[PDB]
Structure 1
Amino acid sequence: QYSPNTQQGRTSIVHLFEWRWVDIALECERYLAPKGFGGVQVSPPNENVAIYNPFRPWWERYQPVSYKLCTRSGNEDEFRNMVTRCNNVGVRIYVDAVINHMCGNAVSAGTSSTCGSYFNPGSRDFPAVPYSGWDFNDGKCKTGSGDIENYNDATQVRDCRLTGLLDLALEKDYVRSKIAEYMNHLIDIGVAGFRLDASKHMWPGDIKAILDKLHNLNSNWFPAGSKPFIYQEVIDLGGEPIKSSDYFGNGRVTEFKYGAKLGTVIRKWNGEKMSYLKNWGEGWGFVPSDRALVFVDSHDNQRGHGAGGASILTFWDARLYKMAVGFMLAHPYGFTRVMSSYRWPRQFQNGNDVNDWVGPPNNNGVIKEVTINPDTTCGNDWVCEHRWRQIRNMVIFRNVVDGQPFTNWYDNGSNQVAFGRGNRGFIVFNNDDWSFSLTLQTGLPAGTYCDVISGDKINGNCTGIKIYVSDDGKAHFSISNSAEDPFIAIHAESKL
């Protein structure tokens, strides 16, 4: 459950947040496969509550009504079509599995669901699954409100409602079986793994019981004995009775401290500087690298809805964001997830963004298709960070240096640092308020290399900066604190 199952040489997955199945299918063939992306995190593919107040928020998808593959992203056939086409081109699909709960207990009964299924939160009835009052933790939760009230009580965090969301009795074999039924349907269709939503709110043992019911991956695309990739969403920062290590026996876990600290370091909050990243990784109190799923920002915390708070870097902070993603993709720690978002009318009031609920680009609730502009960027308000030259090229950079050791580190005691990945890659950063001009040992073989941040190698020539490595592996780098992108990266495949 720890192996991504991506095909040899692809090292990252991209979260195509709220994309329609048809658009993801096209993206797999036209861009993801050609550019070497390993896989795609898709939004919950199961039927959710259609919320109109506010108008169709992104979070309505974390409010299950049934396990029918029927959402604003498309129907079951479109989903299967997407998984098949992506797999045929070597790009894996990872499903966002919302299995801890169903919808909010206050939601009105009726058929206000993405597929018309009837449901009645009040009486705990979800006939489309089916689930009844006997399948929820109402009688097990010991808080006065029935919701989670105190995170210092590990029991309540697991048995009570996360902000009103009906909590499934995951210790019952019936519920475990209905959930495994849903997940096995997806595995047999061809998905390679799952993001387990709200894992902190489930007992490690209950999750394990469900995983034991899972099939091996589809033998038409994967070698016999392949187990699905499992990454558990657990927000674990400082002191809490619950630790992300409690979930290691089930698969990897999301390391939220990663994006949080990279953000404060690059923003240089409270005296932090890049020279400190020298021992980045477990040295910073993070989980072991082989159990980590890392990222700079997620759909949750990019809008202030998750761990990290204000330090998190997103596409809104373009310049610093690219540099953070660059460091992540170059550093050997963890398995990397790249974010791909949509723009929304951010509107801060008293420090909080009042429009953090806004769902994906749409026309009367119908999600807009992703349009590709002539320069490869996206239209219809999709940001497509994964298509930014700077990000796409660092994705490739990680593929080229895969397996290579962390070496040749340099820092000026402040914010200009550099390091290499064996003899396959080298990257330099300048986050100080003054220029950087120095000769560094790169460990790379002599030659002329194209800087993949400022340009591309395009048939015997570079469209951007060029670096010359001498016989002893030394090379000169110049980055003024005024450069559009204050960092340079060169690798074995950008060599002329």
Structure 2
Amino acid sequence: QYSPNTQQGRTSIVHLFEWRWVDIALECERYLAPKGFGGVQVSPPNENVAIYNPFRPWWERYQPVSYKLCTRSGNEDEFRNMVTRCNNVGVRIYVDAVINHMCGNAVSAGTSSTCGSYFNPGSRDFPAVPYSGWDFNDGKCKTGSGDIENYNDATQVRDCRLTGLLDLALEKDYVRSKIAEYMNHLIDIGVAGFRLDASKHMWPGDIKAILDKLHNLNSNWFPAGSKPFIYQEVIDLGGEPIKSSDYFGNGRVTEFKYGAKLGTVIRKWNGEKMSYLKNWGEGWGFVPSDRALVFVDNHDNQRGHGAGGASILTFWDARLYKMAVGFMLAHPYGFTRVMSSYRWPRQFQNGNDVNDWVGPPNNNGVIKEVTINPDTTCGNDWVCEHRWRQIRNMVIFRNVVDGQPFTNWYDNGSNQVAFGRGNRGFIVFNNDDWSFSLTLQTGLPAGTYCDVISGDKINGNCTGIKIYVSDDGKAHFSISNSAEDPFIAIHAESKL
């Protein structure tokens, strides 16, 4: 469950947050495949609560009503159509599995759901699954409110309602089977793995039991015996009884400390600086690289809805964001996930963003399609960070240097650092307030390379800056602290 099951040469997955199935299908064919992306993390494909207060917020998708693959992103067929089409072009589909709970216990009963299924949070009836009061942790939870109250009590964190969400009795074979039933359907459709949402709120043992029920990937597309990829959503920043290591027996875990400390460093907060990144990875209290699913930001914290808090960088900080991602995408630690967002009317008051609830672009609740601008950017308010040259090109960089060790590290003792990945790649950063002009050992083969950040290698030429590597691997670099993109990236496949 540790292997992403991407096909050799693909090393990242993009979170096409709130994208419809038809749009993702097209993206696999038109961009993801030819650009070498490994897979797509999709929003919960199961029926959820239709919330109108606020209007169609993005979080209404983490409030399940049934397991019908029928949401704002599309019905079951469109999902199949997507999974097939993406697989046929070597691009995987990872499902955001919301299996810890159903909806808010206070949500009105009725048919206010994405597929119309009737449900009753009050009487705990989700006849579409079906689930009854026998399937929830009401009796098991020992808190006075019934919800999670104190994170220092590892039991209540798992047995009580996460902010009011009805907690499924995951120790019951019946519930385990209804979830596995949901996940295997998806597996047999061709999905390559899952994001186990709210894993901290699930017992490592209960998750295990649910995985023992899981099939092996669809043998039409995957090697026989392919276990689905599993990355548990667990927010562990230390100082809490629950550790992410407790979930290593079930697969990978999101390393939330990653984007938190990376944003702290890049933002140069509390005295932190890039030169500290030399021992990036485990040396920072992060989980083992082979157990880490890393990312700069995620749909939650890019809104202040998650771990990392204030230091987290997002597309809103576009300049430092490309730099943050550039480093993540060049560093060998973990399996990388690129965020792909949409613009929302963000507006701060007294420090918080009051529009963080705003769902994806839409017309009367109907998610707007992703339009592709002539310059490959997206319209309809989709940010499409994965289409930004500096990101998309660093996505390719990771594939090209895949396997190569981390070496030839350089730092000025401040914020201009550089390192290489074997003899296949080299990247330089300058986050200081002054120009960086120095000849560095790149460990690369002599020749002329295209800087993939400022430009691209096209027709046997570079559209942007060019680096010249000498017979001794040496190469001169020059980045102005006021440069549009304060970092240069060259690799084997950008060589003229």
Q: Normalized against structure 2, the TM-score is what?
A: 1.00
Alignment of 1:49-68 (within 5 A): 49-68=49-68
Cα distance in structure 2, aligned partners of 1:70 and 1:291: 32
SS at match of 1:215: coil
SS at match of 1:302: coil
Q: Counterpart in 2 of 1:165?
A: 165
SS at match of 1:4: coil
Deviation at 1:126, TM superposition (A): 0.5
Cα distance in structure 1, aligned partners of 2:432 and 2:241: 39
Cα distance in structure 2, aligned partners of 1:440 and 1:215: 50
Q: Deviation digits for residues 441-494 of structure 1, max 9, x if unmatched?
A: 100010000100000011111000000000111010000111000000100010
Deviation at 1:439, TM superposition (A): 0.5
Q: Deviation digits for residues 7-54 of structure 1, max 9, x if unmatched?
A: 001000000000000000000000000000000000000000000000
Deviation at 1:342, TM superposition (A): 0.1
Cα distance in structure 2, aligned partners of 1:29 and 1:362: 24
Deviation at 1:256, TM superposition (A): 0.1
Q: Counterpart in 1 of 2:349?
A: 349
Deviation at 1:159, TM superposition (A): 0.3
Cα distance in structure 1, aligned partners of 2:432 and 2:288: 30
Cα distance in structure 2, aligned partners of 1:224 and 1:480: 51
SS at match of 1:377: coil
Alignment of 1:419-458 (within 5 A): 419-458=419-458
Q: Deviation digits for residues 111-138 of structure 1, max 9, x if unmatched?
A: 0000000001000000000000000000
Cα distance in structure 1, aligned partners of 2:105 and 2:471: 68
Cα distance in structure 2, aligned partners of 1:358 and 1:172: 36
Deviation at 1:312, TM superposition (A): 0.3
Deviation at 1:238, TM superposition (A): 1.5
Cα distance in structure 1, aligned partners of 2:201 and 2:43: 19
Q: Counterpart in 1 of 2:211?
A: 211
Q: Deviation digits for residues 259-295 of structure 1, max 9, x if unmatched?
A: 0000000000011010000100000010000000000
Cα distance in structure 1, aligned partners of 2:273 and 2:217: 44
SS at match of 1:311: coil
SS at match of 2:71: coil
Deviation at 1:68, TM superposition (A): 0.5
Cα distance in structure 2, aligned partners of 1:274 and 1:53: 43
Cα distance in structure 2, aligned partners of 1:7 and 1:436: 38
SS at match of 1:490: strand
Deviation at 1:245, TM superposition (A): 0.2
Cα distance in structure 1, aligned partners of 2:460 and 2:268: 39
Cα distance in structure 2, aligned partners of 1:171 and 1:178: 12
Cα distance in structure 2, aligned partners of 1:69 and 1:427: 42
Q: Deviation digits for residues 164-222 of structure 1, max 9, x if unmatched?
A: 10000000000000000000000000000000000000000000000000000001000
Deviation at 1:84, TM superposition (A): 0.2
Cα distance in structure 1, aligned partners of 2:129 and 2:405: 49
SS at match of 2:116: coil
Cα distance in structure 2, aligned partners of 1:104 and 1:438: 57
SS at match of 2:257: helix
Q: Deviation digits for residues 350-378 of structure 1, max 9, x if unmatched?
A: 00000000000000000000000000000
Cα distance in structure 1, aligned partners of 2:433 and 2:129: 58
Q: Counterpart in 2 of 1:134?
A: 134
SS at match of 2:440: strand
Structure 1 residue ranges, 4+ long, deviating more than 4 angstroms after superposition? none
SS at match of 1:449: strand
Q: Share of identical aligned residues, percent?
A: 100
Q: Aligned pair count?
A: 496
Cα distance in structure 2, aligned partners of 1:163 and 1:449: 52
Cα distance in structure 1, aligned partners of 2:315 and 2:451: 22
Q: Deviation digits for residues 309-351 of structure 1, max 9, x if unmatched?
A: 1100000000000000000000000000000000000010100
Deviation at 1:229, TM superposition (A): 0.3
Deviation at 1:146, TM superposition (A): 0.3
Question: Structure 1, unaligned stretches of length 5 or more?
Answer: none
Cα distance in structure 2, aligned partners of 1:305 and 1:460: 45
SS at match of 1:419: strand
Question: Structure 2, unaligned stretches of length 5 or more?
Answer: none
SS at match of 2:302: helix
Deviation at 1:239, TM superposition (A): 1.2
Deviation at 1:301, TM superposition (A): 0.3
Deviation at 1:76, TM superposition (A): 0.3
SS at match of 2:461: coil
SS at match of 1:103: strand
Cα distance in structure 2, aligned partners of 1:135 and 1:225: 32
Alignment of 1:260-279 (within 5 A): 260-279=260-279
Cα distance in structure 2, aligned partners of 1:143 and 1:83: 42
Q: Does residue 96 in structure 1 map to residue 92 in structure 2? A: no
SS at match of 1:199: coil
Cα distance in structure 2, aligned partners of 1:16 and 1:460: 32
Q: Counterpart in 2 of 1:362?
A: 362
Cα distance in structure 1, aligned partners of 2:273 and 2:158: 38
Cα distance in structure 2, aligned partners of 1:452 and 1:338: 17
SS at match of 2:489: strand
Cα distance in structure 1, aligned partners of 2:316 and 2:2: 32
Q: Counterpart in 1 of 2:395?
A: 395
Cα distance in structure 1, aligned partners of 2:232 and 2:31: 28
Deviation at 1:65, TM superposition (A): 0.2
Cα distance in structure 2, aligned partners of 1:488 and 1:42: 31
Report the aligned-residue RMSD.
0.4
